[PDB]
Amino acid sequence: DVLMTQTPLSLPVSLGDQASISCRSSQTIVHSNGDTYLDWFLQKPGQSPKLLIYKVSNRFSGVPDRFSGSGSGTDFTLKISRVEAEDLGVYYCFQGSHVPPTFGGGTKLEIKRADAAPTVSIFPPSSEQLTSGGASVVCFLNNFYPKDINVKWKIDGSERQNGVLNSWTDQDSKDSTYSMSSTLTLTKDEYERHNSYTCEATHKTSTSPIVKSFNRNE
Amino acid sequence: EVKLVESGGGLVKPGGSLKLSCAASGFTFSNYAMSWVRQTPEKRLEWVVSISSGGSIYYLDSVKGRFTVSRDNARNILYLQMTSLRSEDTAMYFCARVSHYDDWYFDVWGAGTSVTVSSAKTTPPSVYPLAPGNSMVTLGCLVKGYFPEPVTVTWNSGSLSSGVHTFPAVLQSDLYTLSSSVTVPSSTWPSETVTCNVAHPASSTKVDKKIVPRDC
């Protein structure tokens, strides 16, 4: 089988700059005629893959000239000139020359934008959940950049770590930001045994950690 | 309109069977070669099988003898019959059209259909509202303890699509949990209602949860 190796595995880039992605095969991919059947696909988040370039350098219908392909032997490159936030997604090379047709592992292109602090919101457990013997305190850190960020939980000013779960979204295609949720899970009995729940967000946009919290007293 | 729509995905146990379908429309189905390409949870793309217009079939060695591809050139439908399913067959299955030009490439793909191979049993989700404790207000829905993926989440039946994002589901204790965030102008809430709709196909579940402000 033909193995397609892609580099880099992740790739940051600013709007307007050029992006370069490499694909290397385990053997030359020429066909019986004299053509190389290497294609590039782009898979935007939530969508299905879509052909950009085929046969090394030919643009597919509707693909701007900003996209170009080249290469020979085992090295192929895809260049994206003047990156627009919409180019965001996972790029994949592919060869149909040999059986079985194979794809590279993909290169994720992320757009670099001006840093942005998050917008933090905390939410108390729902009466509906409390009823079933459980309780979850949720906190949203929305539309921020860069992706890196820390979240600290406090119960009455007493930092809590066990039972916390964080999950990040992919980069938005609109504002090029990230958002993340932090979910502290504890029991009803335990939850009601205290009052001041706090959610602190520490991001590089400030040494001061954005703080939000509530009290079962109101 | 040239389009492909796949269906039939779901939770199947090891060694079990499952038949997938792909409805073509907008082009002369019978003239084109077709393929099934899957995407593992790792996001890796794998060619599964290809069937030409001539009816000839080529399988990926690892499914040869287990999978059976077929086509109904009358109803314009492509099928993939899977038997002896394994954990590694877990993936998003995509239907794709192959176009020749005298060579070939995949020029059309459908949205895919999810298939999860596992011994674990189905578990519907519990859906809880997320209401705040001053220009915009963020609300949300907590969808937790369900299996398998996926679930769909919309706000106000899909009419409230801006300022919306859903956090990836995270597996923990063999159950997935995720939450959805919706931000709207504060001047329209609680005024104009905000409700999230959550469907979990595997458990035939469909819950609507209205985000009502906490008073007490």
- From the list B47, B60, B133, the residue facing A124 with the nearest CB is B133
Partners of A90 on chain B (C-beta within 8 Å) are: 43
- The correct answer on CATH 2.60.40.10 for the domain covering A1-113 is yes
Q: Which CATH superfamily is domain B120-216 in?
A: Immunoglobulins (2.60.40.10)
- Which helix (DSSP H) or strand (DSSP E) does residue B86 occupy? none
- From the list B129, B138, B168, the residue facing A167 with the nearest CB is B168
Looking at chain A, the domain(s) classified CATH 2.60.40.10 span 1-113, 114-218
- Any CB–CB contact under 8 A between A209 and chain B? no
DSSP letter for each residue of chain A: ---EEEE-SEEEEETTS-EEEEEEESS--B-SSS-B-EEEEEE-TTS--EEEEETTTEEPTT--TTEEEEEETTEEEEEE-S--GGG-EEEEEEE-SSSSPEE---EEEEEE---B--EEEEEPPPHHHHTTTEEEEEEEEEEEBSS--EEEEEETTEEE-TTEEEEE----TTT--EEEEEEEEEEHHHHTT--EEEEEEE-TT-SSPEEEEEETT-
- In A, minimum Cα distance to B49 occurs at A100
Partners of B154 on chain A (C-beta within 8 Å) are: none
Q: Which residues pair with A19 in a beta bridge?
A: A80
Question: Is the dihedral angle over the CA atoms B200, B201, B205, B206 positive or is it negative?
Answer: positive
Q: Which of A141, A126, A144 is nearest to A185 (CA)?
A: A126
Q: Do domains B1-119 and B120-216 have the same CATH topology?
A: yes
Q: Assess contact for B80 and B20: CB atoms under 8 A.
A: yes
Touching B: A residues 54-113, CB under 8 Å: 54-55, 60, 90, 92, 94, 96, 99-103, 105-106
**How is chain B split into domains, by residue range?**
1-119, 120-216
Q: Assess contact for B112 and B133: CB atoms under 8 A.
A: no
- Any CB–CB contact under 8 A between B168 and chain A? yes
DSSP state of B87: G
- Any CB–CB contact under 8 A between A15 and chain B? no
The alpha-carbon gap from A18 to the nearest alpha carbon of chain B, in Å, equals 25
For residue A133, count CB atoms less than 10 angstroms from its CB and return exposed for 0-12, middle for 13-18, buried for 19 or more. Answer: exposed
- Which helix (DSSP H) or strand (DSSP E) does residue B159 occupy? none
- The correct answer on CATH 2.60.40.10 for the domain covering A114-218 is yes
Distances (CA, A) of A37 to A31, A33, A80, B52: 7, 11, 20, 18
d(CA B26, CA A192): 59
- The experimental method is X-ray
Reported structure resolution in angstroms: 2.2
> What does the block give as tokens for B55?
């009816």
Cβ contacts of residue B130 below 8 Å, gap of 6+? A123, A126, A138, B139, B140, B141, B142, B179, B211
Backbone conformation region of residue A104, classed left if phi is above 0, alpha if psi is from -120 to 50, else beta = beta
Q: Which CATH superfamily is domain B1-119 in?
A: Immunoglobulins (2.60.40.10)
Q: If you count DSSP H runs as helices and E runs as strands, how many of each does chain B have, helices first? A: 0, 19
